[PDB]
Amino acid sequence: EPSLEQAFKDPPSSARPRVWWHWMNGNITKDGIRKDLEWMKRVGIGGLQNFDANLQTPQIVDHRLVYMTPEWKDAFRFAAHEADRLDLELAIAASPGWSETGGPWVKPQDGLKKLVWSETTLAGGQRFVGRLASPPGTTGPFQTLHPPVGVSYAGEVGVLAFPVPDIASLPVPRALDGAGNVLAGKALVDADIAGGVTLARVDGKAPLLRLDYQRPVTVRSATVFVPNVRGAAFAGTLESSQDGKTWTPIKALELSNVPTTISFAPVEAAHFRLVLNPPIMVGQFELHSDALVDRYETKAGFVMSRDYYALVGPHDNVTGVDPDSVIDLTDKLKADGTLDWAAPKLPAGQHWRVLRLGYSLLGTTNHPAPPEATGLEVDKFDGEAVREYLEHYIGMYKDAAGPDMVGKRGVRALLTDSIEVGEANWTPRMLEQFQRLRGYDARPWLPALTGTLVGTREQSDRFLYDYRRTLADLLASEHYGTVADVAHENDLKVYGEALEDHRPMLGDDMAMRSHADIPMAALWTFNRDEGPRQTLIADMKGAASVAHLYGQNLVAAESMTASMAPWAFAPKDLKRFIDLEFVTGVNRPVIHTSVHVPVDDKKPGLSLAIFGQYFNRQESWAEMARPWVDYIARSSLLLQTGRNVADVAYFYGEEAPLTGLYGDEPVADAPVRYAYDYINFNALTELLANDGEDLVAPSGARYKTIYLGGSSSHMTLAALRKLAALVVGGATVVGKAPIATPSNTSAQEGDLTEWSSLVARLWPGSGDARVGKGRVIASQDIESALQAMDVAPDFTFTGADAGVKIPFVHRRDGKGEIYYLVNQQEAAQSIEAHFRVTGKQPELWHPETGKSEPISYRISGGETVVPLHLDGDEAVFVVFRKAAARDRVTLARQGERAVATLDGAWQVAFQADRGAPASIELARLEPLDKSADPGVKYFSGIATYSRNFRVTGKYGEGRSLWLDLGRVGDLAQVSVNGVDVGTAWHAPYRLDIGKAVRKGQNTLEIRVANTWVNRLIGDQQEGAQKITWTAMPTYRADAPLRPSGLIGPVRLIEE
């Protein structure tokens, strides 16, 4: 019912931001829960997401509430009833602690699994005698490795046999450390890859391991493991001494928590050195006569690579085991361990290799929960196991809160925090899943997962790609799809984060969020010098793209996490962060964090370890945060309205996720004057359809073109088929022809030729070809291609310096357009802004106030030009909804005129119990932090400034009167003749008072709030009577104070 103008004045609950609400280490009371949630209502917060966080925190309650005990459950039930009563959306995390999906009700068999194996050799012309050695059952990341500085499970996978050539066995070398110490060489091939030799350090560092032989040996591959390389700083190089003193490097070895295998063109030498460029024990160092899968450990998913296409193999033209030769002996293994097999005869020089595949546990656990609530992360690739995990977990909260308080009331939502559970690469249905998703049998290729080259290096590399891709597919469907299904079956919504930070595991961070009701990302605070963490830009852009393409519309972000900056933020410091989230596509900030306040006496009290935000009822400016939250709620409202408008669908390939591709370097490829969404393989192949020359999704997302970016130079036949079909159906593609498929699917299904035909059709050579009813522009210049399609820029601007960024969001409704602009610079800008819109008279909408303002404009030639002044870091909405009566309006120029400076004496009254005197008189406005009085100097809280002032004008009726406060530390709420005229919380600190003043004498009261910083510093001073309590120390007595109070000058200004 309400108009957009009314909603903008008083945003609805759906527009109001949420907070994270950590319960710190049992420091919980019902009394505090109510005061927390009543504070959130006062301040306009729309919801909260609870965590029971088992991080070591001093006990400030009479007794800690232990997770899921009766008193804890009654506290949570109370929280749920208070959120219901107060109309706050309550969410919980998907596991005890905060991530991911794990707990002690996960049976050992259902934990995360890694592939393990034993190997045996046979003659052929012999019945295998005895027992196949059991694969390792150790919990840990690989084979026999343990987790770093007791629950276990060993499963079966299968038994494979395949012929292999008799190979030149290698002598045991002399192991010389860098110094010349003689090491136990045999321990380098030991059954214990974690236990080998300790290296001595030589001057100039360069620890090395020389392997000197008595004859030349031909080496093709090497495996190395250095225990505890845990940032994880160490490289390694393999060199060969032909003479013992001249070295030619063979290849480098990236080291990690799992072994590293490299393969190369053969080398004949009697001396091999492992050099460890930056107790150093080398657990394994093994040279191989044969060619192994180069870097198989990472390709098999035991450890991540940033870019799997970058793992360029040696060009040695070798071919390994013939896949057709591989035999499945799974049948023949008996529980006894014996194998009943008649090994068929082989050519001479060729023996049998029998591979016994099994699985064992990673052992990773949910965090941070108490031991009783800590247990295995559920197998993320097994939908049934995930469902059992989550149905049980939800059952616990229905018991705790009561079933009436889970679903439509009380607990409304589930949060899947960003995932980091280690590197799992097996799940029991894997062979069926691989067959169904990739279209061919993985069984003949499994030996590649253990290092054994199958077919050509390229075929094994493509199989491993296909294997990694199946794991990524199952993560999205079997974990995140199941989580959303179970939540929905229980009337819950899902807030869903993904990778967030570079590439912690396999998976696509759009697909991982495509099933969630609210795709979610994160943004940390950052110094303006340094800029944001790039991975978090990609994280948010991915999440926004999901919501646009799959129709969720809502885009959440874990907002404004801060590290080692105790209580050092007022809204003036935060605006640029939330504006960056807004302009990237976030429209539901979830503030990190609002720690639960269990007792009132300790101020500012508990914090989530070393992290901020510190946004709870103990914050110094907490009772004046409503205008800040209103700013976020008003911005979110407009940024949820209608649909996102974007012209470019940026296809980023089938390899690394967005936080991987752009974890360090931002996308350099994207348009500037046009908006864009990322599209992944699923979006490309399932959502996009032709609409004339456009590509549309069921959500209403609508694009002029697909851009081939990211890793799309490697493209699968399945993707290419869909792309060709959309082109032929009328769509435009901008990009250069892919150079290869990364997958074996098309070769295995016999579709060799078709990939090349489709490339030849879409990229015939001209570089700009009509293809069916569509068009392929063979360019990597997106804006020049859009120009050649006659697509005008959506937003652009003149009149600013070079390098000035004013990024934008474009929203669209049946009622008109909304552009969101952010001047990402401290310097004010005066621009002419060009919008691709017509027929509408623009207005500026200000989220600070909820008011709209008319603006001059000219409509002409398919665009509207608007002259804009933007303060430093100003964010503003340019709204095109009113039908334009005229095509040009030039508003009368408005001048500014200082009318008076409110200099002279002020009364100041200080919030009680804050170490300050009740009141002072200032002959002159002065920064309180420069005061001679320590109780004023170090004051944190609300100082109330008081004064009268004379007005000799009539205002409102065509002439306005502004109060400019000058410098303010840090925000100020202003009352004129008892009337609240607003609160100024960022520069320029200016408020419209024309309506509240009267002729003659007027009363003025200005409530200035600052941060806790100064009172914290004040408490470190020698002799200090301590006002504050925090868990750990925050500032040294050295620390520079923040400017505090009403600094001014305070001026009356007429238009």
User: Which residue stretch of 184-192, 417-425, 803-811, 940-948 sits at the interface with Na ion (rule: CB under 5 A)?
Assistant: 417-425
Of 560 and 791, nearer to Na ion (C-beta) is: 560
User: Which residue stretch of 167-175, 416-424, 436-444, 942-950 sits at the interface with Na ion (rule: CB under 5 A)?
Assistant: 416-424
User: Which residue stretch of 389-397, 412-420, 659-667, 688-696 sits at the interface with Na ion (rule: CB under 5 A)?
Assistant: 412-420
What CA–CA distance (Å, rounded) separates 722 from 726?
6
What CA–CA distance (Å, rounded) separates 319 from 317?
7
Beta bridge partners of 104: none
Helices (H), 729-875: 745-748, 752-762, 782-788
User: Which residue stretch of 11-19, 83-91, 336-344, 514-522 sits at the interface with Na ion (rule: CB under 5 A)?
Assistant: 514-522
Of 514 and 743, nearer to Na ion (C-beta) is: 514
For the CB of residue 511, give the shortest distance to Na ion in the complex, in Å: 18
Interacting residues with Na ion between 516 and 575 (CB under 5 A): 522
For the CB of residue 663, give the shortest distance to Na ion in the complex, in Å: 15
Query: Using the 8-state DSSP alphabet, how is residue 201 labeled?
Result: P
Contact code string over 362-401 relative to Na ion, x by CB under 5 A? ----------------------------------------
- Phi and psi (nearest 5°) for 994? -50, -30
Q: Residue 353 burial by CB count (10 A; 0-12/13-18/19+): exposed, middle or buried?
A: middle
Contacts of residue 343, defined as CB under 8 A and 6 or more positions apart, other chains included, come to: 122, 123, 124, 125, 126, 127, 128, 161, 352
Q: With contact defined as beta carbons under 8 Å apart, do 878 and 844 qualify?
A: yes
Q: Residue 43 burial by CB count (10 A; 0-12/13-18/19+): exposed, middle or buried?
A: buried
At position 501, the amino acid (one-letter code) is D
Tokens matching residue 786: 């859009």
Of 366 and 418, nearer to Na ion (C-beta) is: 418
Q: Residue 70 burial by CB count (10 A; 0-12/13-18/19+): exposed, middle or buried?
A: exposed
For the CB of residue 509, give the shortest distance to Na ion in the complex, in Å: 12
Of 93 and 549, nearer to Na ion (C-beta) is: 93
Q: With contact defined as beta carbons under 8 Å apart, do 507 and 421 qualify?
A: no
Q: Is 82 helix (H, G, I), strand (E, B) or coil?
A: helix
Of 65 and 522, nearer to Na ion (C-beta) is: 522
For the CB of residue 429, give the shortest distance to Na ion in the complex, in Å: 29
For the CB of residue 36, give the shortest distance to Na ion in the complex, in Å: 22
User: Which residue stretch of 127-135, 345-353, 515-523, 1031-1039 sits at the interface with Na ion (rule: CB under 5 A)?
Assistant: 515-523
For the CB of residue 239, give the shortest distance to Na ion in the complex, in Å: 42
Neighbour count for residue 335 (Cβ, 10 Å): 6
CB-closest chain residue to Na ion:
418
User: Which residue stretch of 335-343, 418-426, 566-574, 595-603 sits at the interface with Na ion (rule: CB under 5 A)?
Assistant: 418-426
What CA–CA distance (Å, rounded) separates 371 from 382?
25
Of 193 and 522, nearer to Na ion (C-beta) is: 522
For the CB of residue 500, give the shortest distance to Na ion in the complex, in Å: 5
Beta bridge partners of 868: 831
For the CB of residue 588, give the shortest distance to Na ion in the complex, in Å: 15
User: Which residue stretch of 58-66, 410-418, 504-512, 752-760 sits at the interface with Na ion (rule: CB under 5 A)?
Assistant: 410-418
CA dihedral 705, 706, 710, 715 (to 10 degrees): -150
Closest of 335, 344, 489 to residue 407, by C-alpha: 489
Is 418 a residue that touches Na ion (CB under 5 A)?
yes
For the CB of residue 592, give the shortest distance to Na ion in the complex, in Å: 8
Of 547 and 557, nearer to Na ion (C-beta) is: 557
For the CB of residue 130, give the shortest distance to Na ion in the complex, in Å: 51
- Phi and psi (nearest 5°) for 594? -125, 85
Helices (H), 491-562: 534-550
Is 416 a residue that touches Na ion (CB under 5 A)?
no
For the CB of residue 971, give the shortest distance to Na ion in the complex, in Å: 29
Interacting residues with Na ion between 821 and 850 (CB under 5 A): none
For the CB of residue 555, give the shortest distance to Na ion in the complex, in Å: 15
For the CB of residue 516, give the shortest distance to Na ion in the complex, in Å: 14
Q: If binding means CB under 5 A, how many residues of this protein chain bind Na ion?
A: 2
Of 400 and 523, nearer to Na ion (C-beta) is: 523
Of 188 and 520, nearer to Na ion (C-beta) is: 520
Beta strands at 732-734 and 774-777: parallel, antiparallel or unpaired: parallel
What CA–CA distance (Å, rounded) separates 95 from 597?
22
Residue 668 Cα distances to 329, 538, 788, 1023, angstroms: 51, 12, 21, 56
Of 365 and 829, nearer to Na ion (C-beta) is: 365
Is 95 a residue that touches Na ion (CB under 5 A)?
no
Q: Residue 1000 burial by CB count (10 A; 0-12/13-18/19+): exposed, middle or buried?
A: exposed
Of 100 and 619, nearer to Na ion (C-beta) is: 100
Of 93 and 354, nearer to Na ion (C-beta) is: 93
Beta strands at 518-524 and 493-496: parallel, antiparallel or unpaired: parallel
Of 100 and 478, nearer to Na ion (C-beta) is: 100
Q: Which helix (H) or strand (E) holds 877?
A: strand 875-883
Distance of CA 510 to the CA centre of its chain: 11
For the CB of residue 496, give the shortest distance to Na ion in the complex, in Å: 11
User: Which residue stretch of 317-325, 415-423, 564-572, 851-859 sits at the interface with Na ion (rule: CB under 5 A)?
Assistant: 415-423
Contacts of residue 981, defined as CB under 8 A and 6 or more positions apart, other chains included, come to: 963, 974, 975, 991, 992, 993, 995, 996
Contact code string over 707-736 relative to Na ion, x by CB under 5 A? ------------------------------
What CA–CA distance (Å, rounded) separates 213 from 272?
8
For the CB of residue 523, give the shortest distance to Na ion in the complex, in Å: 10
Of 263 and 613, nearer to Na ion (C-beta) is: 613
Of 329 and 498, nearer to Na ion (C-beta) is: 498
- Contact set with Na ion (CB under 5 A): 418, 522
